[PDB]
Design an enzyme around this catalytic site. Structure first.
Site, mmCIF file in Angstrom:
data_model
loop_
_atom_site.group_PDB
_atom_site.id
_atom_site.type_symbol
_atom_site.label_atom_id
_atom_site.label_comp_id
_atom_site.label_asym_id
_atom_site.label_seq_id
_atom_site.Cartn_x
_atom_site.Cartn_y
_atom_site.Cartn_z
ATOM 1 N N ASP A 1 70.727 16.464 0.471
ATOM 2 C CA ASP A 1 69.847 16.643 -0.672
ATOM 3 C C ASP A 1 69.624 15.301 -1.370
ATOM 4 O O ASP A 1 70.275 14.294 -1.078
ATOM 5 C CB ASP A 1 70.446 17.666 -1.651
ATOM 6 C CG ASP A 1 69.397 18.312 -2.551
ATOM 7 O OD1 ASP A 1 68.177 18.052 -2.407
ATOM 8 O OD2 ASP A 1 69.800 19.114 -3.420
ATOM 9 N N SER A 2 68.689 15.295 -2.307
ATOM 10 C CA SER A 2 68.262 14.059 -2.937
ATOM 11 C C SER A 2 69.106 13.666 -4.154
ATOM 12 O O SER A 2 68.979 12.530 -4.623
ATOM 13 C CB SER A 2 66.783 14.151 -3.305
ATOM 14 O OG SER A 2 66.475 15.364 -3.957
ATOM 15 N N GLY A 3 69.968 14.557 -4.667
ATOM 16 C CA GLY A 3 70.969 14.198 -5.655
ATOM 17 C C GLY A 3 70.666 14.615 -7.079
ATOM 18 O O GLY A 3 71.606 14.806 -7.852
ATOM 19 N N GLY A 4 69.403 14.810 -7.445
ATOM 20 C CA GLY A 4 69.099 15.119 -8.833
ATOM 21 C C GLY A 4 69.523 16.518 -9.231
ATOM 22 O O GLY A 4 69.954 16.746 -10.366
ATOM 23 N N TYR A 5 69.402 17.477 -8.312
ATOM 24 C CA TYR A 5 69.818 18.838 -8.620
ATOM 25 C C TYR A 5 71.276 18.870 -9.029
ATOM 26 O O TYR A 5 71.649 19.532 -10.006
ATOM 27 C CB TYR A 5 69.610 19.747 -7.403
ATOM 28 C CG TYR A 5 70.187 21.121 -7.614
ATOM 29 C CD1 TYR A 5 69.444 22.117 -8.220
ATOM 30 C CD2 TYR A 5 71.487 21.420 -7.218
ATOM 31 C CE1 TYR A 5 69.978 23.378 -8.431
ATOM 32 C CE2 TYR A 5 72.023 22.663 -7.417
ATOM 33 C CZ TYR A 5 71.269 23.640 -8.034
ATOM 34 O OH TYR A 5 71.804 24.887 -8.245
ATOM 35 N N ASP B 1 63.342 15.205 -6.388
ATOM 36 C CA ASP B 1 62.585 16.143 -7.194
ATOM 37 C C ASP B 1 63.385 16.513 -8.431
ATOM 38 O O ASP B 1 64.575 16.217 -8.541
ATOM 39 C CB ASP B 1 62.300 17.435 -6.422
ATOM 40 C CG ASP B 1 63.565 18.177 -6.014
ATOM 41 O OD1 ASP B 1 64.584 17.531 -5.686
ATOM 42 O OD2 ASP B 1 63.517 19.420 -6.024
ATOM 43 N N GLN C 1 57.709 22.715 -6.358
ATOM 44 C CA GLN C 1 58.189 23.211 -7.646
ATOM 45 C C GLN C 1 57.098 24.053 -8.304
ATOM 46 O O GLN C 1 56.183 24.525 -7.619
ATOM 47 C CB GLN C 1 58.686 22.053 -8.511
ATOM 48 C CG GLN C 1 59.841 21.291 -7.888
ATOM 49 C CD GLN C 1 61.162 22.043 -7.971
ATOM 50 O OE1 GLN C 1 61.291 23.011 -8.706
ATOM 51 N NE2 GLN C 1 62.147 21.590 -7.211
ATOM 52 N N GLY D 1 63.411 25.039 -6.862
ATOM 53 C CA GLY D 1 63.332 25.687 -8.159
ATOM 54 C C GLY D 1 63.680 27.157 -8.188
ATOM 55 O O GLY D 1 63.410 27.821 -9.193
ATOM 56 N N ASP E 1 70.545 27.104 2.986
ATOM 57 C CA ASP E 1 71.876 26.608 2.641
ATOM 58 C C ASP E 1 72.424 27.452 1.497
ATOM 59 O O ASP E 1 71.665 28.020 0.713
ATOM 60 C CB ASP E 1 71.795 25.160 2.138
ATOM 61 C CG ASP E 1 71.321 25.071 0.685
ATOM 62 O OD1 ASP E 1 72.179 25.245 -0.217
ATOM 63 O OD2 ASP E 1 70.103 24.847 0.430
ATOM 64 N N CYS F 1 82.545 41.574 14.634
ATOM 65 C CA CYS F 1 82.511 40.120 14.644
ATOM 66 C C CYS F 1 83.246 39.566 15.855
ATOM 67 O O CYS F 1 84.349 40.004 16.194
ATOM 68 C CB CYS F 1 83.164 39.606 13.359
ATOM 69 S SG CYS F 1 83.224 37.804 13.219
ATOM 70 N N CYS G 1 84.272 36.412 16.101
ATOM 71 C CA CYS G 1 84.942 35.156 15.800
ATOM 72 C C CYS G 1 86.413 35.217 16.218
ATOM 73 O O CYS G 1 86.980 36.285 16.462
ATOM 74 C CB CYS G 1 84.765 34.782 14.328
ATOM 75 S SG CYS G 1 86.044 35.378 13.185
ATOM 76 N N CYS H 1 88.782 37.441 14.015
ATOM 77 C CA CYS H 1 88.690 38.881 14.218
ATOM 78 C C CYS H 1 89.212 39.289 15.584
ATOM 79 O O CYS H 1 89.632 40.441 15.765
ATOM 80 C CB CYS H 1 87.243 39.320 13.992
ATOM 81 S SG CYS H 1 86.731 39.133 12.254
ATOM 82 N N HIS I 1 85.975 32.832 9.465
ATOM 83 C CA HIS I 1 85.273 34.078 9.703
ATOM 84 C C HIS I 1 83.914 34.083 9.011
ATOM 85 O O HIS I 1 82.915 34.515 9.589
ATOM 86 C CB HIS I 1 86.093 35.267 9.222
ATOM 87 C CG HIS I 1 85.253 36.479 9.030
ATOM 88 N ND1 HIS I 1 84.850 37.268 10.086
ATOM 89 C CD2 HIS I 1 84.652 36.980 7.927
ATOM 90 C CE1 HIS I 1 84.051 38.216 9.633
ATOM 91 N NE2 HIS I 1 83.914 38.060 8.326
#
Ligand SMILES: CNc1nc2cc3c(=O)[nH]c(N)nc3c(CCc3ccccc3)c2[nH]1
Ligand SMILES: CNc1nc2cc3c(=O)[nH]c(N)nc3c(CCc3ccccc3)c2[nH]1
Ligand SMILES: [Zn+2]
Ligand SMILES: [Zn+2]
Lengths: 355, 355
Positions: free
Chosen positions: A79-83, A128, A175, A202, A252, A290, A292, A295, A321
Site C-alpha cells: 500500500d501507499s502508506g497514507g491510509y 491517495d 475515491q 474509501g 486483502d 478443510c 489444511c 484439520c 487454518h
C-alpha cells in the site's frame, strides 16, 4: 518470460470474472486473496507503513529488497502508506502530502512511490487519501479531487524510475465516498491517467455491508472492464463473495491473521470462537471439509487446549487454518465462475455460513 | 513387534554411552533430548500438572488419551506432578501425599500413577519429593526416605494396572540432595524395588553447574549401569554435554521453548538475543551450520524484525530453530560417542560455545 503485467479474463458469470494476472515473478489467479506477508497464495502484502519506520525503506533496500528480506520470490503488493498514517499516527495534511510523528516523517506521492520502489514491490499503489466515513458531499469531493491530483503525481513518479516502470505495476485508487457522481468523476480521472489496475478505495471504513455493496453496485462498472479491480480492506468471507458478485478481482483483510491470534476460526458453517468451553471435548477438526494440515491432524479440543494454555502453537495452528480456509474459498469461487455455477455457489455458501 | 521396554548400549567412551530404548510405540536414540509436546525427537513430554487441572486426566482419557489428543503416536514421558505442585501451587504435605489448591486437589503415589495411566504415557515417573536446595543433611535424609517409601507405592500402583504394566515403563527417581551417602542409600532402595530406568532427581534447583557435576560424579555410578539414566530438568547445551560425560542418557528442559518465546536462539557459538540491534542488518541465518528449515530460508535480520514487531511467526521460527538445534546437538553427541571421538567433541564444543 512472463510480461511485466497482463490480465486475462478466462470466464465470466454475471458481473463476476475469473482469470489471471501474469507478472515477471509469477501468475496471480483471480479472484485472489492476498494475505499479509508476515502471517496457496499467489501474492502477499508488504506493510509499507511499518517498514518505513522499522527498519526504514533505505535499510530494506540495503538488505536486498523485500523479496530477499522475507524469503518470498513471488509477487508482493504494497500500500501507499497514507491510509495507515491516518489510522495509526498527530498528522498535518497539505497539498504536498502528510506529515506525522519519535522522529517526524513526511509522505507525499513522490516519497510513497520511492519507498515502494526501495521495498521492491511488484504491485505499487498510488498515494491517495482514504476519505473518512461519513463525509459530506463537499468534503468527499475536495478529498477525491486531491487524491486525483495525487494519482497523477504517483503515475509520474513511478514512470521516472526505470527499474520500477519496467518491472512493477501501478494501481490507481478510486475515491468519492458513497456518492455516485464523485465515484464517476474519480473513475474518469484515473482512466485518463491510465493504470495497470484499479482499486476501489474509501470502503471498509465503518459503512456496513449493505452500504458497501450499494456503492460497489455503481462504482465497479465505472472502472475499465479489462483491468483488475481491487477492493481495499475487504474482508469477511461473505463480503468477499458479494464483492466478487459485483466484479471485484482482488482482496486483502486483517481478518484471517487477526482472528487467528484472537481465537476465531473460519469454517464453512461460519466463524467459531475456539476458546469457548463447548469445544473442550470436540474431536472434530476446525472445519469438517478443510484440507489444511491442521484439520488433517488435530482436533478442536486440542487447539482449544493450546490456546487456553497460552501456547504459541495454538495461535500458529489457528492462523495456518484460517489462511488455508481463505485460499480454499478463493479456489471454490474461481472454479465456480469457470464452471458457470457461481450464482448457485454464493447462494449455497450464504445458506450454510449463516445457519 | 517391539518389546515393552529394552535398553541396549551400542557404544561407550569413558562414562558416556549411546544406544537405544525400544518401546512398543517407537525407538528412542540415546543420549536423548525430550522436548515439550506442545512446542527429530523420538519422545516428547506431557505436562501432568497442567493436564490434571485442564481438562483433567479423566477427560483426557475420554478423549482417547494423550497420544490421540496431541496427534503424536510415538512415545510420551510424563512427570509425576509433585515437582510442579511444589513449584507452582498453598500446599499441605503428609506421608499420604500432597494437597494443594479453585478446587483443592490431592496427589499421592497412587493418584499420580493413575493420572499417568489415564493420560496414557509410555514412560511414567514415580511420585517423588524434589528436596529444596539447599537442604540440611537431616532434612535431605527425611525427604529422601519419604521419596523411597513413595517409590515402592508407585511401583505397586503401576503393577496393579494391567494395561500400564504390560505397555508402559516406570522410572524410579533418586534423591538425597548433594550428599553422597544419601544418594547411595536412595540408589540402593530404588534398585531393590526395581525400575525400568533411573532418574537423578533433586538437581537443576539452583545449585549451579559445578555443584551439579560434582553430585553427578558420584551419583550416576550408583545407578544400575544397564538401565537408562535420566537427569531431570537439565538443561543448557553445556550442561547436557557435561552430564553425558558423566553417564546421563536422557534430558528435558524448558530452555529451547522458553528461549524461543523470549528472543534467545541457540547457536554453536553460544546463545544470541535476536532482539538486539546488532542483528537488524545481519543476513546470516540464526546459525551458520544449522540444517533446520528456518536457517535454510530466513536471516537473523528478518527474524529480528518479526520479533521486534510482535509477530507470532517470529517466535515460531525461533522455537523451530531451537528445537532443531537441540536435536542436532544430540545427534552429534551420539555420533561422536559411536565413533570414539566424544571427548574431543566436548572440548571443541566448549571452546566454540564459550568463545
Ligand atoms: C480495513 N479497511 C480498509 N479500507 C481501506 C481503504 C483504503 C484506501 O482507500 N486507500 C488505501 N491506500 N488503502 C486502504 C486500505 C488499506 C489496504 C492495505 C493495507 C496494507 C497493505 C495492503 C493494503 C483500507 N483498509
Ligand atoms: C528445571 N529443574 C528441574 N529439576 C527437577 C527435579 C525433579 C525431581 O527431582 N523430580 C521430579 N519428579 N521432577 C523434577 C523436575 C521436573 C522434570 C519434568 C517436568 C515436566 C515434564 C517432564 C519432566 C525437575 N526440573
Ligand atoms: Zn483447516
Ligand atoms: Zn536453524
Amino acid at each position: 518470460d512472463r510480461p511485466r503485467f497482463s490480465f486475462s479474463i478466462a470466464a465470466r458469470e454475471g458481473k463476476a470474472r475469473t482469470g489471471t494476472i501474469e507478472m515477471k515473478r509469477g501468475v496471480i489467479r483471480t479472484p485472489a486473496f492476498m494475505p499479509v506477508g508476515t502471517a496457496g497464495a499467489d501474492i502477499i502484502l508488504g506493510n509499507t507503513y511499518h517498514l518505513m519506520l522499522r527498519p526504514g525503506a533505505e535499510r530494506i533496500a540495503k538488505l536486498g529488497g523485500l523479496h530477499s528480506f522475507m524469503g518470498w520470490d513471488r509477487p508482493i503488493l504494497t500500500d501507499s502508506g497514507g491510509y495507515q498514517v491516518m489510522s495509526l499516527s498527530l498528522t498535518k495534511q497539505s497539498e504536498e502530502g502528510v506529515t506525522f510523528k519519535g522522529s517526524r516523517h513526511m509522505l507525499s506521492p513522490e516519497r510513497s512511490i520511492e519507498i515502494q520502489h526501495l521495498l521492491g514491490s511488484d504491485i505499487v499503489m498510488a498515494f491517495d487519501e482514504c476519505t473518512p466515513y461519513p463525509a459530506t458531499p463537499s468534503r468527499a469531493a475536495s478529498s477525491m479531487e486531491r487524491s486525483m491530483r495525487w494519482a497523477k503525481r504517483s503515475r509520474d513518479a513511478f514512470d521516472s524510475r526505470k527499474e520500477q516502470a519496467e518491472n512493477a505495476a501501478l494501481f490507481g485508487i478510486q475515491q468519492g465516498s458513497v456518492f455516485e457522481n464523485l465515484r464517476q468523476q474519480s473513475a474518469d480521472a484515473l482512466a485518463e491517467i491510465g493504470f495497470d489496475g484499479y482499486a476501489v478505495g474509501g470502503l471498509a471504513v465503518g459503512e456496513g455491508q449493505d452500504e458497501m455493496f450499494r456503492v460497489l453496485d455503481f462504482s465497479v462498472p465505472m472502472l475499465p472492464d479489462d483491468k483488475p479491480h481491487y477492493l481495499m480492506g475487504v474482508g469477511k468471507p461473505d463480503d468477499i463473495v458479494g464483492a466478487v458478485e459485483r466484479g471485484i478481482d482482488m482482496f486483502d483483510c486483517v481478518l484471517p491473521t487477526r482472528s487467528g491470534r484472537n481465537g476465531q476460526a473460519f469454517t464453512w458453517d461460519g466463524p467459531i470462537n475456539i476458546r469457548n468451553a463447548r469445544f473442550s471435548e470436540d474431536l472434530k477438526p476446525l472445519d469438517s471439509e478443510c484440507h489444511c494440515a491442521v484439520c488433517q491432524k488435530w482436533s478442536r479440543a486440542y487447539i482449544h487446549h493450546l490456546i487456553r494454555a497460552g501456547e504459541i502453537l495454538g495461535a500458529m495452528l489457528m492462523t495456518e487454518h484460517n489462511i488455508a480456509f481463505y485460499q480454499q474459498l478463493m479456489q471454490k469461487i474461481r472454479d465456480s465462475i469457470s464452471e458457470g455455477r457461481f450464482s448457485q455457489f454464493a447462494q449455497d455458501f450464504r445458506a450454510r455460513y449463516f445457519a
